[PDB]
Amino acid sequence: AIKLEHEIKVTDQALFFDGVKKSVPQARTQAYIEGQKYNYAYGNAIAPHGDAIKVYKNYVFMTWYRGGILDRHVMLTRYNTLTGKSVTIEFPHQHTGFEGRWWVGETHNTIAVAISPKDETIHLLYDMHAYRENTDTGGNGDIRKDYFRYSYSLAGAASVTDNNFTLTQFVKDTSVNSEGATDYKHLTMTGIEDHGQFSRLTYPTFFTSHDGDLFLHMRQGSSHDGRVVFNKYLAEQGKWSHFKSFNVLGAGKKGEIKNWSIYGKMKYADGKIRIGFQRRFNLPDRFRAQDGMFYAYSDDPSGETQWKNYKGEAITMPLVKADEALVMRPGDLLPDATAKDQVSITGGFDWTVTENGDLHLIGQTNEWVNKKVIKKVYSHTYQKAGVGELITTTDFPPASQLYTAGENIYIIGLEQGRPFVEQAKGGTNDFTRVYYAPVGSQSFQKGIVHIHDGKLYYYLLEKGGAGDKRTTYLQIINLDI
Numbered sequence: 008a009i010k011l012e013h014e015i016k017v018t019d020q021a022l023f024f025d026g027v028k029k030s031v032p033q034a035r036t037q038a039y040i041e042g043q044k045y046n047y048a049y050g051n052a053i054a055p056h057g058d059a060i061k062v063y064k065n066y067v068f069m070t071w072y073r074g075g076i077l078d079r080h081v082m083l084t085r086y087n088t089l090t091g092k093s094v095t096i097e098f099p100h101q102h103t104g105f106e107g108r109w110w111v112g113e114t115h116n117t118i119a120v121a122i123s124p125k126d127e128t129i130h131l132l133y134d135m136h137a138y139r140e141n142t143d144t145g146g147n148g149d150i151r152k153d154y155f156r157y158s159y160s161l162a163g164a165a166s167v168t169d170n171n172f173t174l175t176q177f178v179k180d181t182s183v184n185s186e187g188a189t190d191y192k193h194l195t196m197t198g199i200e201d202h203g204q205f206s207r208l209t210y211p212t213f214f215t216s217h218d219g220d221l222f223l224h225m226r227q228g229s230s231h232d233g234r235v236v237f238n239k240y241l242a243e244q245g246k247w248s249h250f251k252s253f254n255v256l257g258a259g260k261k262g263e264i265k266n267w268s269i270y271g272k273m274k275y276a277d278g279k280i281r282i283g284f285q286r287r288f289n290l291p292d293r294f295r296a297q298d299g300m301f302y303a304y305s306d307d308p309s310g311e312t313q314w315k316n317y318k319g320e321a322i323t324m325p326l327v328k329a330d331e332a333l334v335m336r337p338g339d340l341l342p343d344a345t346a347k348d349q350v351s352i353t354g355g356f357d358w359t360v361t362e363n364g365d366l367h368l369i370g371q372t373n374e375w376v377n378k379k380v381i382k383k384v385y386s387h388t389y390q391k392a393g394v395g396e397l398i399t400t401t402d403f404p405p406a407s408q409l410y411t412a413g414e415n416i417y418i419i420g421l422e423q424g425r426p427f428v429e430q431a432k433g434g435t436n437d438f439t440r441v442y443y444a445p446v447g448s449q450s451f452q453k454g455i456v457h458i459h460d461g462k463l464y465y466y467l468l469e470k471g472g473a474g475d476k477r478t479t480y481l482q483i484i485n486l487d488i
């Protein structure tokens with residue numbers, strides 16, 4: 008059976024935004040008040056959040072911001088699964104909040120972490136929400152040479168002894184734009200400063216191939232005109248390739264009816280670089296936000312060429328018209344919801360492909376009437392073994408992410424604060440609960456998952472804390488593959 012193997016405390020000082028929600032004009036406008044609680048613009052929990060946990064050999068790497076409101080330092084912790092010991096590096100960068108207003112917490116601004124399986128370099132990307140050289144921080148720091156924030160290490164740093172796991176392992180900024188002796192933030196990944204390439208980026212998320220290649224993807228642009236870009240770590244050269252567009256910017260002048268923005272994630276799944284996403288058109292129509300459900304995969308191990316849709320048909324690369332990668336229309340789940348903004352798709356999208364080729368996508372599609380959600384529909388679209396008709400069903404529980412290991416797909420979450428695991432054979436919608444932490448165990452408020460070598464690494468926020476410093480834990484659960 009699935010069993011909990013290890014439960015480890017990461018910190019009692021994880022940053023939490025213990026204030027109230029602010030609107031974007033408030034967050035942009037209001038001055039600091041000394042003694043205020045830590046208000047926020049989007050979510051209230053920046054840790055664990057984002058691409059913040061990775062496993063490499065016997066090490067679990069976890070990122071987080073340290074509390075409280077006056078600290079906010081970027082932190083990197085390494086847990087050694089062989090010794091049970093942890094070591095943590097404190098970086099000089101502090102969370103800059105909403106457009107430099109560091110007293111308003113900004114959950115888009117996550118700390119992503121990856122290890123190159125080839126040269127054991129550690130890569131960090133943090134605190135970014137589409138910034139650019141003329142971003143107006145309202146007097147809170149100069150961002151002209153700090154709009155893209157990248158930190159990286161010496162080769163072999165991933166596996167040094169705990170005593171040597173320090174900032175000494177990381178490479179300072181020594182370019183003409185360097186800020187000084189404690190500047191660890193680089194403005195580019197290629198060694199070439201390039202505002203056009205590295206401005207307006209959000210959502211750093213790394214993925215790794217079977218042969219040990221490391222990739223990154225981000226979203227570039229705005230909610231009205233946005234693309235996914237991705238690059239590859241060049242281990243032989245100690246740098247990254249040029250960003251490559253999965254989809255164009257300015258599609259309205261290149262063959263689409265209008266500009267659009269992309270809402271999804273690239274992953275490495277069943278041996279291929281792939282992407283799943285929904286589209287925001289910003290048309291005056293029945294869609295309050297996103298529309299459609301899309302998927303494509305590359306038969307190129309570098310993911311640069313040979314892109315295809317679910318049917319195996321080649322797609323235009325870079326993509327201009329999203330409909331080429333169509334899988335289904337979530338609008339069809341609410342077919343009488345035709346009034347302006349009556350179909351509200353604002354999240355809950357995910358997708359996976361199992362090691363047997365089974366394709367799975369989930370979505371949440373809400374009916375929006377007089378400024379309120381009046382109906383929530385969860386969908387599960389799947390195709391067994393990559394062939395045959397797509398099945399879309401709404402007989403799917405309220406889950407927001409899908410995971411895979413061996414032949415199965417999994418739903419993983421918190422129920423009454425306790426981790427559970429539901430599992431289904433790939434290519435089916437037949438789920439059964441196979442793990443639930445017992446009564447008397449701890450309660451958690453939030454969690455992020457990382458699946459590695461048949462085990463579930465659950466990076467969790469403990470429930471019930473107070474103030475702007477909370478406790479996080481790492482759980483290691485054997486999926487019994």
Ligand SMILES: [Ca+2]
Binds near residue numbers: 152186
């Ligand atoms: Ca710098």
Ligand SMILES: [Ca+2]
Binds near residue numbers: 292
């Ligand atoms: Ca719309």
Ligand SMILES: [Ca+2]
Binds near residue numbers: 336337
């Ligand atoms: Ca649709």
